[model samples]
Target: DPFEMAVKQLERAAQYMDISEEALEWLKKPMRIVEVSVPIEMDDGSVKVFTGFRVQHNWARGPTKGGIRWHPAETLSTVKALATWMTWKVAVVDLPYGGGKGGIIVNPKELSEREQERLARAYIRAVYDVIGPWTDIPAPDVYTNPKIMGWMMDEYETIMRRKGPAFGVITGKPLSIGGSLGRGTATAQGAIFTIREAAKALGIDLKGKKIAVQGYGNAGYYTAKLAKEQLGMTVVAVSDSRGGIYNPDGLDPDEVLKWKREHGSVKDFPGATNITNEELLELEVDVLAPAAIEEVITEKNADNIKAKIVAEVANGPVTPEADDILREKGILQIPDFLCNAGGVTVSYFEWVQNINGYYWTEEEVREKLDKKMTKAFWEVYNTHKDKNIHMRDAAYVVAVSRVYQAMKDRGWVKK
Candidate 1:
């Protein structure tokens, strides 16, 4: 329903901005959709077919940039939605990139390294004609990681023959190959920065806040660890794809993270009690970071959530229906893009580095990211109070209006 909410906000912004209907309608559909039928030969010489999608939503501002996600739930609609959000996300932070998103419809956990490489190469082959350093750039998302990105960039370079640096073609790469130093932890770190701002604004103390992370993937694990160790907050509950674990005494986030890296899930942690993802969500934590999927917070269960402040680390974690409920319940909600914008802010930095042929150190990157995210948070937070609107709506008004102004300035709005 958050996707629906996203559309609603878009509609409101489009109206307020008074953009031409033709442009809004045109912006609604993806500029390009490439559906590739990937046939990979398995180790046993059996051919397996997979479906993949890449949606380029816009490129008015600059190159169409987005992440290539690998998840079983990938769909064309989901890709479209995510690409649209990316467009707004970049514009919100004033980045010189439009929006694009790609995905393969399969669970990567079932694939070997060889198979994964083949699949990555296959994706590049299908989308190569359109992607380039200056046209469209792809990075990591969902189940995709830096290693996979290296393969895609390498494949693109190989097709060009000779020697192409190809680093500019992808954002998140291994530091050895030109990846940004803070790219790995940027998302979580950004979320932490925004959450800190939200805590202060809402008068919530982090001295001993009980925090629960609904997902324990790359972002979730790091966010939990940083919140606990750096802020003196306690991670009372954490969950992975399989299930969750609750230990009121505070589970060691580092050990749980290591356990997840080795054991594939957090269900069997020694001293923690196993809990369902739902139970983890409804826990009485001081802060709840839903770093999981879309529509996790719906009208049915929104009331069950007991957190004083809800920080969305994932895109569209709370639906519009749930937004109404949370607002009615007086819960302080840090909207997704605002709370988890570190990835794109640093991504903005990476793009600048690539364009300038220079990279920044981790400390410098983190410092710049904090300034951008914190400023954006206060900008939206102030708008929320001044306009007497929900934080999410305030963010949308600020973000979408900026994009619309740019579109209008270019005379892109046709009758």
Candidate 2:
């Protein structure tokens, strides 16, 4: 379903440009798709097999880069759509990477700590030969974190038998193992930069504005944290997969986060009323941020959305049909590729550091991230205004045009 949504978005974008049919066909499909069977020994001395996928969407600009997610709903098409979005994300931000993604089908929570490590290692073993620093790189994604990434990096090194550091092969690792500074908050911070610009464009001050975030993962937590601490916005509502909690007065994101850690969800924080994920979307908030999975805002519920600003932190959170509805309603939507690209942008920074053996301080990294995100935000914002199109289409135009140029410049297609 997400892959179909992805293709529909591409088709809409192609209508505004003069892309050749040959190039269109090439861009419609991935360059490579690897499906593997990862069989690992469980802690109970039993063997279980899991399905895995890695999709390399394009390589015209450089080696592919994306995250590896381990979720029970993981599918080849889902990974394909995410991989394609990654291509557009990197291109829009002018990163050297193309796009790629990996995934395994299993509930990570069901696996013990040691079992998770084995699963991580087995995934690397299954796809290790196909992925490398100069080939395709991987990082952490949903249900995966720095510890899992560290395990994966070690597994890759053991397989390759290289003595020196191989940090280039993966990112989002623990700082003790060469993770980049500011990476944990990069996605949200970059989005905050764009949200700041979007608010200014609408002549609305972020201070004390009500905001609702529809996911409580890494990205959602940081989005709320930074919006309150930096922008002075009131994060009124925040949700996890189970449900959400809301307060009309205001909610403290840090305390909510603490409750989530101890209670395993944000549904029952004291002094807050409970709400479903659907209710969170239709709340009369100034900003609505979806940081969860794909297709949450579809045609069915698009008309019910009341937020003036829809900031998509998750890949493909809003469908193309929803894009049309939102555009008709005149809601300012910061597209996923452009809004949440901070993760890959800093991943690119980490890659550079790895290649050169030089690391920047956190301040340096954050400063660079702000500059890049700000420049990119205005680039897309101006394009949207000049062309009189939805922000998503403008983002697509910027990214697809760059990717088309890269293909032409590399002689992959005619001029």
Q: Report lDDT (CA) for all predictions.
A: 0.84, 0.90
**Candidate 1 lDDT, 1-415, residue by residue in tens:** 5346546668876654446677777677777888988877777789899998888887778888899988898878888888888888887666778889988998889899999999999888888888888888898887888899889888888886725546788878777776787887888998898888888998878988799999998899899998997678999999988999999989899999888888888988998999999888999988999998767899778999999889899878998889989999999899888888888878778867876788899889988988898888898898789878888888877776666666777777744
Candidate 2 local lDDT, 1-415, one digit each (tens): 9899888878889887789999988999999999999999998899999999999999998999999999998989999999998899899888888999999999988899999999999999999878988888898887889899999999999988975557889988888877789988999999898899889889999898999999989899999888989999999999999899989999998899999999899988899999998878999999888989778998778999999999898876998789989999989999888889888899999988887789999989988998888888899999898889888888899889899999999999995
Question: RMSD of model 2, in Å?
Answer: 2.7
Give the number of the best model, judged by TM-score: 2
TM-score of each: 0.86, 0.89
> Which candidate number would show the highest lDDT if scored against the true structure?
2
